[PDB]
Amino acid sequence: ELYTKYARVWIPDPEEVWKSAELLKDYKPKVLQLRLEEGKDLEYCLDPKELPPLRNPDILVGENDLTALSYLHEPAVLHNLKVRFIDSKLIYTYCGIVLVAINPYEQLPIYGEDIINAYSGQNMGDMDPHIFAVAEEAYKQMARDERNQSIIVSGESGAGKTVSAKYAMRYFATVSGSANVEEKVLASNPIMESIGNAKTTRNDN
Amino acid sequence: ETLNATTPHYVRCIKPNDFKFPFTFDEKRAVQQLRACGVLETIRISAAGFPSRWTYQEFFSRYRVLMKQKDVLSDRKQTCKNVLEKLILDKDKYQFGKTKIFFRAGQVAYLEKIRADKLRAACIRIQKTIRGWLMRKKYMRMRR
Amino acid sequence: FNKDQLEEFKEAFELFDRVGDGKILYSQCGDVMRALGQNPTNAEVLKVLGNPKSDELKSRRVDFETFLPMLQAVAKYEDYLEGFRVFDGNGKVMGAELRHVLTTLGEKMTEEEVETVLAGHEDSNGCINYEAFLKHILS
Amino acid sequence: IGVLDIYGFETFEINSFEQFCINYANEKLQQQFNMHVFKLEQEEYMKEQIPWTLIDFYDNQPCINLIEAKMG
């Protein structure tokens, strides 16, 4: 079976939601001899029934699309997002047709003008993910066919939905050839915040 | 009614830490946000299907390490259909598209693991042979 | 092994004896096995040695008589060729790729062993005729 | 081209009519998303000459009917 010595598994840990482990002896049908980083050695119960999530190989890890991963589960997704965000500072990622945007609180250069002209024309897979790539996929489908296009943004309001919309609109403005939609809409934002936003136990504004 | 008129495109936003730190990723908060954005359930729905797709040439390139020269053939598509049909027993796991192979979850990891095993054992055999041949020469040098 | 082979091997053993007590280290057992024409894996050497600990592997000394059954046990081409075509099948091998895989995969060797065996065998592009290199390392 | 800023699925130690309405809205949006993804994948399967009857569709209509249908 797929469980062997020198294989990696995810173990549940209450401090960090999953922890990596290596298997010290090959499994054969009720306990596993598990290595860790937190000490060399550990003995880990299996449960009446369960085997841990098996870890993807590192060619697939850090791919631009979560569905490139051969095993798909919460540990692989959480790890792959964490390594893209922490190591490469790639805040944008794909999952199926969804664009996952992980909000850095730090400001980035990547929104700068030239990249708008770099993404434009490029089919959605031909470039690494960025909000301009979805803005194009909409603008291109609008130009190609009759239909209007929609972009739908979800998450706790701190997460930066408004920043994503703002940059999508900058993409549209810069490709389309303008005047003063963007400045007016962002001027409207404080009004709609003041009359429509609220303070909730989990979240201010 | 307003959305149904229109073709959608989606963005999800996740808040990586509770305290606005510039790049700290808190896996508890990010797990909660990934559940609240339905990304994890979307991924569950995808993992049931064929999530993983490969173009026949890129497959052939990667698994030429596995492929035998007798298996190599004047039609790479037929070559890969044969090699894969041998390598993975249950046809339910995979499908042959016109230009892409489709795999259920794990099957590409299965191929990658058998590749790493074969390449490791072959590397061990060649390495031990070169180490023996050089040290055997040092043995003959000490004899001389 | 015949009496003549055992005598020649004992003489060789003493040539590898750097202390004069007629003994080698556990860590030398593998060296003697490969020097005597065997090609055991590191795993096979450690297995026939009984998975010795670092301390006794580096400082515990054994005479020829205890080593001998282990040498015997160790003692008792087309796969090698396909194995080399793995790392290419036009009869060449990248020098960079072979060096990387030999120093990073399997039972990793040092760069100096690879440089020693590879000296003069790679061309300007860095390609090795692996059938000739294989015959060379098996000779 | 129309850009929707909405709130996501929401749960607290205490959940109340506000959270119940937010969750019903998110159930509807998630249904639309699931149908759109299923349509695109059916088109890709018909494009690639696979039997499209294989692809499995996952439908939260029983929950929407629980919340909104008559005697919901």
- Count residue pairs from B and D with Cβ separation < 8 A: 45
| Radius of gyration in angstroms for the set of CA atoms belonging to chain A, rounded to a whole number | 22
Resolution in A: 3.2
For an interface test with D, give the residue of A94, A124, A161 to mutate (most D CBs within 10 A).
A161
In what order do the strands lie in the sheet containing A8-12? A8-12, A18-23, A31-35, A41-45
Residue B93, number of CB atoms within 10 A of its CB: 16
The helix/strand/coil state of C15 is helix
Residue C119 CB contacts under 8 Å (≥ 6 apart), including other chains: none
Of D52, D60, D54, the closest CA to residue D31 belongs to D60
Q: List binding-site positions of A for ATP.
A: 155-162
CB contact under 8 A, D34 and B45: yes
Question: CA-CA distance, C77 to B124, in Å (whole number)?
Answer: 15
Q: End-to-end CA distance of chain C: give it in Å, rounded.
A: 20
Of C88, C100, C104, C93, the closest CA to residue C126 belongs to C93
The answer to whether the Cα torsion of A71, A74, A78, A79 is positive or negative is negative
For an interface test with D, give the residue of A67, A152, A205 to mutate (most D CBs within 10 A).
A152
Give the tokens for residue A183. 């400045």
Q: How far is CA A139 from the centre of its chain?
A: 23
Residue A118, number of CB atoms within 10 A of its CB: 12
Residue C97, number of CB atoms within 10 A of its CB: 12
The helix/strand/coil state of A172 is helix
For an interface test with B, give the residue of C29, C108, C117 to mutate (most B CBs within 10 A).
C117
CB contact under 8 A, D7 and A156: yes
Question: CA-CA distance, C56 to C69, in Å (whole number)?
Answer: 19
Indicate the pairing of strand A31-35 with strand A18-23.
Answer: antiparallel
Residue A75 CB contacts under 8 Å (≥ 6 apart), including other chains: A10, A18, A53, A55
Flag whether residue B132 sits within 8 Å of chain C, measured between CB atoms.
yes
From residue D12, give the alpha-carbon distance in Å to each of A59, A92, D23: 39, 28, 12
Alpha helices, H only, chain B: 27-36, 39-47, 56-63, 76-87, 107-143
Flag whether residue A204 sits within 8 Å of chain B, measured between CB atoms.
no
Flag whether residue D6 sits within 8 Å of chain B, measured between CB atoms.
no
Give the tokens for residue A74. 């919460």
CB contact under 8 A, A151 and D8: no
Residue A18, number of CB atoms within 10 A of its CB: 21
Determine phi and psi for A72, rounding to 5 degrees: -120, 115
Q: Are D and C neighbours with ≥3 CB pairs closer than 8 A?
A: no
Determine phi and psi for A32, rounding to 5 degrees: -115, 140
Contacts B141 to C, Cβ<8 Å:
none
Question: CA-CA distance, D72 to D67, in Å (whole number)?
Answer: 5
Q: Contact, A128 vs A90, CB < 8 A?
A: yes
Secondary structure element (H or E) that encloses residue A154, with its range: strand A150-154
Q: For D15, which DSSP code?
A: -
B32 CA: distance to closest CA in chain C (Å)? 39
Contacts C39 to B, Cβ<8 Å:
128-129, 132
Contacts B97 to D, Cβ<8 Å:
48-50
Contacts B106 to A, Cβ<8 Å:
2, 54, 70-71
Alpha helices, H only, D13-59: 17-47
Question: CA-CA distance, A21 to A38, in Å (whole number)?
Answer: 9
What length does chain A have?
205
CB contact under 8 A, D5 and A161: yes
Question: CA-CA distance, C27 to D43, in Å (whole number)?
Answer: 64
With contact defined as 3+ CB pairs under 8 Å, the chains touching A are B, D
